[PDB]
Structure formats: C-alpha cells, structure tokens
Homo-oligomer: A and B are copies of this chain.
C-alpha cells in the first residue's frame, strides 16, 4: 500500500505519497519560515499530517526524516541546527496515541536519503555504500551489509563536521555558500580577468559547472580543489568504515565530471589497493527525492 513520506528541512518541509516502485504522488512543499513564523513548527505535525490522512484513508504508515539529531529509541527529535525548536519529543508515542491504526517511524534525514537510494536508486540493493549529499550542508548516510548504519549511540556518520587538512570542517570548505565564496576569492586573485565567470550576476554550482564545461581554467581549478578536499575526507571515512562504494548527491554533484577526477586521485594517493581495486564512485540519481523516499522506506522495513 501507499505510505506517507515526510522530509523535514531548514528552508522547506516536504510531504509525499510513495508507491512500492518509488513514485511520489501529491508532492506538497511547505515550511519552514512560514511554519516557524505563525502557529509554530509542531502545530503546522500535526495540521498538515492530519490533512493528508483525511485525503488518503488507506494510508497505514508515516515515515519522517529529520534534519538533525534524533534519539536512539527513535521517538524524540533532539536538535536541528536550522530549526531551534523540537527537543526530547516522544513523536512516535504521541502520533501512535492520536492515530493508533497507523504505524509511525522516524530517522535522520541524511540516513533516510541513503535508505532511499538503497531501495529505489540506480544502485538499488547495493549492500555497503556511503551517500554524500553535497549541498549547503554536507549530509551522509551509510548502508552496511544491507542495513542502515546508525552508529554506537544512534547518530553516526555526521561527516559534514569532520576536520579537514585545512583545520576547518568539511561542510565549511565544500558547502554551496563556501564554494561560491571560494570562487569569488579566486576571481579576485585573477587580476588579468582571464576567467569567464566575471560576467554572471549571481554564482551557483550549476553556473560554475557550465563554465567548467566550456573549458574555463579558473572554473576547472575550483572543482579540482573541491574534489581533492572531498577525496581527503573520504580517505578518513574509508579508513574508519572499510567501505569503497560512494554515491554523490546534492547541488554540487551536477559538477561530478569536474571534481571526481581529483577526488579519485586523492583516494588513490592515500589508500592502498585493498580499498581502491574494486572501488566505485557513482552519481546519486534520486537527487532531492531520496530523503522523502527513504522516510517512506522506514515503514517498508
């Protein structure tokens, strides 16, 4: 049957009815600014959830992905760095008491995205891999021997906050806003104005990728440096986890061809053949839908 998947986010909140083949029906995008500025975030899980089950009375399950830390028993929302609300909330118990005929499940949103790729992606059922979602923040989810990796205390693989060889965190080096700021820094150093990016009104990963495709030396060098940084953090993840299947998602993944060569180079430079001989670096094809699909996927398990 149809399952309601919810992907809770910092800028937008997403609802969708998921089919067993991974199709999203009646995709509704809200919020988050509009939700916080008004009746509140929790008042807005109950209002928009209630409106969905009324429309689809056959729905028996609701899976929700959360953009932060969740409790080990998967009943509470600990903290969201983009949404200061929801602390120690037994959401599974309160929704089960309200809707006793419906089964509820919660998980971290980056972990949901890995589960989404595992059930519905172009590498579905791949047993052991990491999904790196390279956006404004760096999110990650890991499947290990066909099971979602949650870590010792339930909130594992927070790789965006790992320290780099520069001392700064991974997401403060490769996150979308930091990539744009670094590109502007390199354009400022380009005193001869050789680069073609100087014309554009507002930089974005897509624009920097489009100019790299044309052969712009500056745009290609930016993605090559981003690639080395991602590769250096993947060396550390691989040494700790012993996995060598990598899926790359998020807004920056559109520039896959321009940053993956240096990413692969960094991995070959620092890792022995034990890891690199059968290593795979693929593109995450579900894009921004993986989180919602994975959230619904919780109910399927």
Tell me the A residues contacting B by CB distance below 8 Å: 69, 78-79, 128, 144-145, 150-159, 161-167, 232, 235-237, 239-244, 270, 274
Please report whether the interface of chain A is mostly helix, strand, loop or mixed according to DSSP.
loop
Given contacts A128-B153, A274-B79, contact A240 B242 (CB under 8 A): no
- The minimal Cβ–Cβ distance linking A140 to chain B, given in whole angstroms, is 9
**Further 9 A-B residue pairs, CB within 8 A, beyond A79-B274, A163-B232:** A152-B241, A153-B243, A157-B242, A162-B239, A162-B240, A165-B166, A165-B167, A236-B236, A240-B241
| Most chain B CB inside 10 Å of its own CB: which residue of A69, A156, A244 | A156
Q: With A and B bound together, what is the CA distance between A72 and B100 in angstroms? A: 44
| Most chain B CB inside 10 Å of its own CB: which residue of A153, A167, A270 | A153
- The minimal Cβ–Cβ distance linking A256 to chain B, given in whole angstroms, is 23
CB-CB nearest 7 A-B residue pairs: A151-B242, A128-B152, A152-B243, A156-B242, A153-B242, A165-B167, A158-B239
Given contacts A155-B242, A242-B155, contact A165 B164 (CB under 8 A): yes
Query: Inside 8 A of A162's CB, which chain B residues have their CB?
Result: 235-236, 239-240
